């Protein structure tokens, strides 16, 4: 193996001289704003089946291979979305049966105009939190038992109707890639704390306690001394029927994640546990021999349209906010799992508009908001799912329920629906052993993940969220904030520039010094990299042109009153009777050391580097060529680049040739619209790589020594 | 000028097996936390150094030449400060004396902690404005004429104790540098509102207004409807002697700064506009001849020490957090351009110590939060101040104006006290420039000025502030959010490789290609980058790699049934046309295409792009070697090592080779912490640079074709 490369010193401006550059107009926004309204027949076409996704899925499906599996995984998903919606309609403490308004709704609206193909439509449980919370603050700030629930439906409805809003505003606008300004350590710890939340707020139904309507900050906790603040008044019914169902549902989970391949389709374990636990609870009479909550009649039909109240929408557009980017967000990351497992394309802003709409048509059905449960989507996926006819199938049951079959669901207890929505709930909590693991790979997550749960728990799951998203954007500052900006060496006489502390036989080339800061500089960036670049030169430029300067003066004083005799072989002096005295320039006269030193009246030029007469004392300095390297460099914004000009014209003021090498085109392409170059800063200080420079440089000493 | 090099292909392997590296030591944490323990005489003797600088800058003190300088220089902004006092007490809505008070006690203990030595302590528009709103705010919220302005007072006080007492613990904790988080362009917006807020604030003492204390959101807009809603209740004698002492002293200001050589000090401008203010005042008896509202009676002396309301405390905390980090801001920024201009060290810690020291010996003693005014610190500089000896005298005069003649100013109208604030106001008001500015240079710092003056305009001060400094990270994200990825293709047959789209007779090695993310490729674009790779390559390696174990598996099929031979020659078909029959995976068994192909059960090599038999199709692809620029790439988060990981493998699975090239050490030795490193994904893909890559797979590929 050899690299052996013999070619000319190059400079950027000499490189693209030499190599005549294509020329490419990148853009206008004016000509792509007017082909974004090219409106072709073609085009409109593309648009109309972009927002009408079934109408490309619906006439290419192959019915041997996925109508059977369909209906499977239907009924599956539909059996599970109707425990899953009254549950959840626990959680947002308004009546069950608008659980089931939530479970048929958005998944009628996504069978249409979504775009995934494998996920359940409907409550989950973290949504369902954040609504419930929205919703116990709207009824608070209101202007003025079946009058309670009446106005919490109507603000669920309301929250809902707005989310949806939100969530369509924002896909007609094309904004579908907020889903990038969430890590997944920022997610991994909001769920965890969500879970922990999920988990505090089923209590009131495993005990059958009490517990008011309480609200951020610090939810979790006010809701867990309303809780344990009563323990006393536990009903044991309630709680042994939970623990059983618990129990026996997380052990058959289990078991049909072990035994994935022997079991043909997965044990329906839901189900099976409410229908014994229903038909105990109506052959034993739990209702009046233990005194259980149960889910109780249900009205059987739909709700009629409600008009949204804007007032709430007023009392509740943040929540709303939270609520549309979390719903966004989980359903998102959801389809993405399995539009890459079976390799289908997913568009973000088709989601935007499908889930809005869903979320629209439902609170004005008087259902509440929901996306997507991965445990629902799980259910769906793992009995055979293939096309969003399973969650049409599904909704199909959910409305057989909410018409036909709801008296059956009328002996279940809550408690039942509380230990299945626990028993969901392991996944999630077992991401508290992303702790350790990102303690041990990146800090920077660790402490998003560490410090997005504290905030969640701390304060809401919609203000935890918010200030999440901005530690998480703190983080990047902090990983740029104080760079390990290095000195680089020649290590094998080559074209190799290493950390000069990192290998022996390194070379540093007399008078050059090869420096390196290894991130973007911006704002929080250029005063670290100025105490950074001036510790490593050794001097303060500025320092020593303000000495120069000084020096300069005292000599022009000592000539013109005749002690100091100009001639073009040096500085002879007739007197050496110098006395000790310094002008003490003062404060509006003393900005003058920083100006450019122009020797040019003096017929011969002034050797700083050497010693003057009369005992005139100025710091002298090797450097005479410095480099940097800006390979790592990615952006500069406006902070940056007044920062490093300033910086680039004191070393030029001081006589120390300045190189930036390293850099693409698109670099100083860039910086020739923040008008950095001038007359004292040109382009010739670009050259493609350090050793470029340093062959410049030597070659310049060299013939300077000629 | 011959660039000539001759040197061995080298790995970042190969490299550090060569050339040994120099053995460091650990930076642990643990015996860093052995160092901060010190106890040590010298360094207990420096600590005690730092903290008192006074002690420190006194003794070293040059008497002639800067004492009478600092004696005409704290004369001068004395006499200045005591008028901004008054002004700023206006600002508040608390008695004038109140503004002496702050323009006392700040100064005289900055005396003693500050590593400042010519900035004016004391308080400015901005703060006051802010105290003022937090005040209004704690009044609001707390629990149920001369009583509310005693209330005022009050709240004031113990808000000016709280910013202090947030600041001290910030120098305590050593977080003097947070104000790295706000820049040039975030300032100058946040500053241009402010301005036009302390405009707005003014108005109901040109005209003479009773304007109610509103409060943010939108207080700007509320106060100026209350304005100009009695516009007709304008008193014309305040409106009149305001203009004329406005006009005045922008006149004069002007004169002071164009003809500064001229004039051997300033023309004190305020101080004479005062005078002759308060001398038509009183003579003509503007008090009873045109009820104009004068400055009145103050209490000749200071106050009792006051003790802080915890109330206002609990009402208050993130409106202290807000003046605090303004204050700090604002005098670090001031303090930074004196430090620069006469070349001293700041102590960004004793800064914070200082100012909350300060703050705290105010608030106790009936003031109001101040940190410093750039037109005052202008006034101490320009005058001659040399050290904090003028401070001292300043607030002597401010003394001398409290305990003695402050009666003197009992006829003089707030009319030009708000005259004065706003022609140094004109400053701030000027930066409107920077939008036309920063749009030609970079439109993410327009854009963040733009949002910063609609976020303090609109919001709050505090919570204007707040809003700044997020969208501000958030265009950190902006920035690097959609690279501009590019292919790489070589210039000149040499090792200069550069954009494929931009030159002439440019050269892709066949099979090779070179990808370039200029960024750090993080959580907001592992996504995108992973799309331009693929887009990069014109394949999905996962695709190819699915499509490649379904053609395996159908093979493996016909040959177990006996329908084709395996021999060393290849596959054998004595029956062709085979009948298609595609496997049809379920959802539970799919993921096995995504394994890696292991066909060693067969003796002969599939070469996967030439012809598969009996109609089996697969895609071809020619990429066989797979370079990444990783030069420019600063950082990679755990999002980024997992999406990096990922596709890697992808690739590898697919047979082709993976090289990183261009990273320095320690971003190696990151990635290794990450556990990236496996089998199949090994440390022998890194390479020094493009050209070593290249030359490695060109000796491979040849030493194949060998
Ligand atoms: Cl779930
Ligand atoms: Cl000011």
Redesign the interface.
């Known amino acids: ?10 400079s950027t401006n000499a ?1 693209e001289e030499n ?4 020329g ?1 107009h990148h853009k206008t926004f004016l000509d792509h704003l007017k082909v974004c309204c090219s409106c072709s027949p073609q085009k409109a076409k593309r648009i109309v089946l972009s927002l009408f996704p079934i109408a490309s899925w619906l006439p290419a499906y192959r019915l041997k ?1 996925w109508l059977l ?1 369909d209906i499977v995984s239907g009924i599956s998903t539909g059996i599970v979305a109707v425990l899953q919606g009254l549950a959840f309609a626990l959680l947002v403490d308004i009546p069950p049966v608008y659980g089931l308004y939530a479970s048929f709704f958005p998944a009628i609206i996504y069978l249409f105009f979504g775009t995934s193909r494998h996920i359940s439509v409907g409550p989950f449980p973290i949504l369902s939190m954040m609504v419930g919370l929205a919703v116990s603050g709207a009824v608070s700030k209101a202007v003025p038992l079946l009058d309670d629930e009446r106005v919490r439906v109507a603000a669920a409805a309301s929250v809902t109707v707005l989310s949806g809003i939100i969530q369509l505003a924002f896909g007609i606008l094309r904004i579908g890639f907020v889903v ?2 969430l ?3 920022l997610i991994s710890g909001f769920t965890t704390a969500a879970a922990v939340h999920v988990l505090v707020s089923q209590l009131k139904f495993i005990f059958q306690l009490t517990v008011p309507s309480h609200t951020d900050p610090v939810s979790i906790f006010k809701v867990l001394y309303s809780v344990f603040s009563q323990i006393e008044k536990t009903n044991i019914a309630d709680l042994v029927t939970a623990l059983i169902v618990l129990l026996v549902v997380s052990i058959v989970k289990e078991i049909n994640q072990r035994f ?2 022997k079991l043909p389709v997965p044990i329906p374990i839901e189900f099976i546990m409410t229908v014994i636990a229903a038909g105990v609870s109506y052959g034993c009479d739990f209702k009046n021999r233990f005194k259980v909550a149960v889910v109780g009649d249900m009205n059987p039909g739909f709700q009629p349209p409600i008009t949204p109240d804007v007032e709430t929408f007023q009392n509740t557009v943040g929540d709303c906010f939270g609520i549309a980017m979390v719903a966004f967000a989980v359903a998102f990351s959801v389809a993405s799992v399995y539009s890459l ?3 289908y394309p997913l568009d973000g802003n088709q989601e935007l508009i499908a889930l809005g709409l869903g979320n629209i048509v439902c609170g004005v059905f008087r259902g509440f908001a929901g996306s997507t449960a991965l445990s629902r989507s799980a259910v769906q ?2 009995t ?3 096309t969003q006819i399973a969650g049409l199938i599904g909704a199909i049951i959910v409305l057989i329920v909410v018409l036909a079959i709801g008296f059956l669901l009328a002996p279940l207890q809550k408690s039942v629906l509380a230990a299945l929505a626990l028993g969901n709930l392991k996944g999630m909590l077992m991401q508290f052993a992303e702790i350790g693991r ?1 303690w ?3 800090k ?2 660790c402490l998003i993940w560490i410090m997005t749960f504290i905030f969640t728990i701390v304060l809401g799951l919609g203000l935890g969220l918010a200030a999440s998203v ?1 530690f998480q ?2 983080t ?2 902090f ?3 104080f760079p ?1 900006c290095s000195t680089l060496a020649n ?2 006489r ?3 520039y ?2 000069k ?5 390194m070379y540093e080339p007399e008078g050059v010094k090869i420096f ?1 800061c ?3 500089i ?3 960036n250029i ?2 990299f100025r105490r950074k670049l001036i510790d490593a030169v050794g001097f303060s430029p ?2 020593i042109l ?1 000495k120069r300067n000084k020096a300069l003066r005292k000599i022009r004083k000592l000539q013109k009153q005749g002690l100091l005799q100009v001639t073009p072989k040096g500085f002879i002096c007739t007197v050496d009777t110098i006395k000790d005295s310094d002008e ?1 320039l ?3 006269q ?2 003058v050391l920083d100006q450019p030193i122009n020797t040019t009246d003096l017929p011969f030029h002034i050797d700083w580097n050497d010693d003057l007469p009369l005992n005139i004392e100025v710091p002298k300095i090797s450097l005479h060529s410095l480099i940097l390297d800006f ?5 500069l ?3 940056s ?2 920062g490093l000009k300033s910086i680039l014209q004191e070393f030029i003021r001081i006589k120390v040739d300045v190189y930036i090498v ?1 850099t ?3 670099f100083i392409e860039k910086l020739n ?3 950095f170059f001038d007359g004292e800063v040109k382009s010739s200080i670009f050259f ?1 790589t350090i ?2 420079a340093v ?2 440089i030597l ?1 310049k000493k060299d013939y300077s020594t000629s």
Chains 1, 2 share one sequence.
Do not use: C, W
């Open positions: 193996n050899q690299y052996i490369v013999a070619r000319p010193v190059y490189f190599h005549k550059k294509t490419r291979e599996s990038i300004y890590s997944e350590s994935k391949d497992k079976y390799d996926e793992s055979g799912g293939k990102l041990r790979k990146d920077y997550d901005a954007l703190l990047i500052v990983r740029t904030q390990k290590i094998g080559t074209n190799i290493k950390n502390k990192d290998y022996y036989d390196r290894p991130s973007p911006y704002f929080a005063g670290f500025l320092r303000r003490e003062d404060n509006n003393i900005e390979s790592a460099v990615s952006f914004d406006v902070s680049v007044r390293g693409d085109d698109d619209r923040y008008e493609l050793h470029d062959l410049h070659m």
